[PDB]
């Protein structure tokens, strides 16, 4: 009889960045996708 | 009659010549004055991120 499993651990939720199609309409706003893809990383790793 | 006549065609090629380089000058002056003004203007991305953050997404 060993040990079974630590209930406390939780696996992490493995974040995805959302890609966007290219497009021209993609170049002309890189930078505020960008900004946007990053602002979702940051919320599912902190979880809101 | 005759002595300052020619004292004066005398002096005309040298006045005629630095006259010319004179005016060489000034126009050299003018084109190296000339500069072109290249201004920067805000990017119209952060005015769509602000646009963004105003609707509450």
């Known amino acids: 009889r060993a040990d079974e499993v630590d209930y406390t651990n939780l696996p992490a939720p493995k974040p995805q960045k959302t890609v966007w199609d290219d497009n021209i309409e993609t170049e002309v706003l890189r930078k505020y996708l960008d900004g946007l893809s990053q602002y979702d990383m940051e919320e599912a790793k902190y979880g809101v | ?57």
């Open chain 2, 1 to 57: 009659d005759i002595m300052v006549p020619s004292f004066v065609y005398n002096k005309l090629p040298v006045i005629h010549f630095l006259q010319e380089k004179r005016a060489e000058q000034k126009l050299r002056r003018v084109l190296d004055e000339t500069y072109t003004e290249w201004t920067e203007e805000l990017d119209q991305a952060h005015v769509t991120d602000a646009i963004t953050r105003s609707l509450n997404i």
